[PDB]
Design an enzyme around this catalytic site. Sequence first.
Site, short mmCIF file in Angstrom:
data_model
loop_
_atom_site.label_atom_id
_atom_site.label_comp_id
_atom_site.label_asym_id
_atom_site.label_seq_id
_atom_site.Cartn_x
_atom_site.Cartn_y
_atom_site.Cartn_z
N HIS A 141 -1.63 -10.11 12.85
CA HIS A 141 -1.34 -10.31 11.44
C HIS A 141 0.03 -10.85 11.20
O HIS A 141 0.40 -10.91 10.05
CB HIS A 141 -1.56 -9.02 10.63
CG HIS A 141 -0.52 -7.95 10.80
ND1 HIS A 141 0.68 -7.98 10.14
CD2 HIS A 141 -0.55 -6.79 11.49
CE1 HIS A 141 1.38 -6.89 10.46
NE2 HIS A 141 0.68 -6.18 11.33
N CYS A 157 6.58 -3.71 13.28
CA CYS A 157 5.33 -4.11 13.89
C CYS A 157 5.58 -4.86 15.18
O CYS A 157 6.52 -5.65 15.26
CB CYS A 157 4.54 -4.97 12.92
SG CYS A 157 3.75 -3.97 11.70
N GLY A 211 9.11 -3.97 9.18
CA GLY A 211 9.71 -4.78 10.23
C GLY A 211 9.35 -4.37 11.66
O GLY A 211 9.53 -5.19 12.58
ZN LIG Z 1 2.40 -5.66 12.98
#
Ligand SMILES: [Zn+2]
Lengths: 306, 306
Positions: free
Chosen positions: B41, B145, B143
């Site tokens: 994503h 991820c 932030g």
């Molecule tokens: Zn992520």
Amino acid sequence: SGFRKMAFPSGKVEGCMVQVTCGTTTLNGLWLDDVVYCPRHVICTSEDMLNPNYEDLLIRKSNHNFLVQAGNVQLRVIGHSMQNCVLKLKVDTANPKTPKYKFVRIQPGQTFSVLACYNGSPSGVYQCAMRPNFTIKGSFLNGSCGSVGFNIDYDCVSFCYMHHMELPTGVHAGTDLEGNFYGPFVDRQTAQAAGTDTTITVNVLAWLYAAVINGDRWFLNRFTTTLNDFNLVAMKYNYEPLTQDHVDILGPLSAQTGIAVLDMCASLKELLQNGMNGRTILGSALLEDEFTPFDVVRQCSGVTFQ
Amino acid sequence: SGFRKMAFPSGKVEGCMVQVTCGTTTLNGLWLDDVVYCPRHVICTSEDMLNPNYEDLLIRKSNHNFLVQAGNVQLRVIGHSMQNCVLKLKVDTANPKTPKYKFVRIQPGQTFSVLACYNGSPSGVYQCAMRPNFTIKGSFLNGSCGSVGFNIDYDCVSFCYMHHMELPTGVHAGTDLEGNFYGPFVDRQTAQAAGTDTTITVNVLAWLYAAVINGDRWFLNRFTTTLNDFNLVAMKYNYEPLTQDHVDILGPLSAQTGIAVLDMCASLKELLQNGMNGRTILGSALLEDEFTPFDVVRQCSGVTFQ
Ligand SMILES: [Zn+2]
Ligand SMILES: [Zn+2]
């Protein structure tokens, strides 16, 4: 979003760990530029007794008696010296992994990360605090001496602790990197009695602000108090008396949250006198005092580059 | 000697973190050899809605739309692909800090270290467990991820987790490094309801053995029990049922300590039905379940080179 007991990234310190052997004895050293720092009792023979005069033990120890290695590779020792309770071994090669660094002497109630090490190699990393009685409650086995504690400001390892001994209670004592013990402790295996385990009030409050910032709201109440009134409660439950200096540090968190410092003190007062109702706070069933206001701000946070 | 919540040394993983930007969006990636792994994503637009078909979102994304940096320096992307819920960005340069590594899919109740990262750079490291309901209770801001979880066997990073989303409860969900989510979770901002928070029985017992190995003895009692009797208690307090397989794992700790596994179960039974008397265990006022039997053995310990 989440608040965890968080250590500093430790790769910068991993790069400085070496093992130091003298005689028979083996512990860890810290290699920064062309100096290796380690506890002076690497020179003894490991018991109660037999000669303690680190000076005279040391008169018998030449440069070539200090064997310094990590990873596989030997370091050449060209000079040595004793600085309070640490040895400084001058080596011929500068550590190419030397990070920007400083030594400082931390204040009681400050937190830092420890890189637990066993004769030169990394084992694990955890966060702790310098207790008001100048012990730390760590995880140190036979071999861990010379492991270090440190902070990182955004670009820098400041080294604050070197591990030297376990006390009776099984709590831990050590030095700054200038070799001065925290507290009254000495590198000699004699009784010492630790000292009053006392709770770091301003850190508990900072952690309560963390709980709110994450929705563990229940300990908000409709009361307030005063510094003098709160400190009576503090000197019944063996908490540090709170001062306006503590209140000022917490300023950003009160404004971050809109909850006045003295109102949070009244929440804490209530938690002290009445306990936690079988309820928990940030998955803790007791009040937590090894996060500083600095640690809390950093963890609902800011830094970046996108 | 001391038992702490202990993370793995994280320098080996620090060396693999990069930031990845696509479009507007920014998260972390893991650079191993000539591949960067990141959550798919990174390609979306960050909301509920608007197009979810990662396939078609992806049809619009060329190699040059994936901007990959850490420290200052740009990496050149020569190929990309989607593998379940992760992207694999092939870059022209092999990471010179690539550690020996493996990917594995960890089992529920296993612990691992997380290196929390914000667009490419290290923030901190902490230990957690994969919960029986396949969430983890972490510390992840806007932030984080692409931050990863990992273990190290003595010579190796095995990567086990990549962070992808926060749920309603504010607990965390992610994937293995093959891109498969742990549990039923999906990379889409829809309700999910976490799942029964349930306690990892074999880990609590291992932690009780740690307490004894350190002298926090008080929860020893003069009782025993049976697996079936203990498991009745477990399925009242939402604990994992204990099996002989759990008993076998704990074998070394029972013999390390001379305390029979079922006797320790009777201590635990008593702690469940009666609580902790306002007393604490290893400075914990509730039972702790994110140390495995593996974690406990490692912490009164063995490894070395002297
Ligand atoms: Zn992520
Ligand atoms: Zn030492």
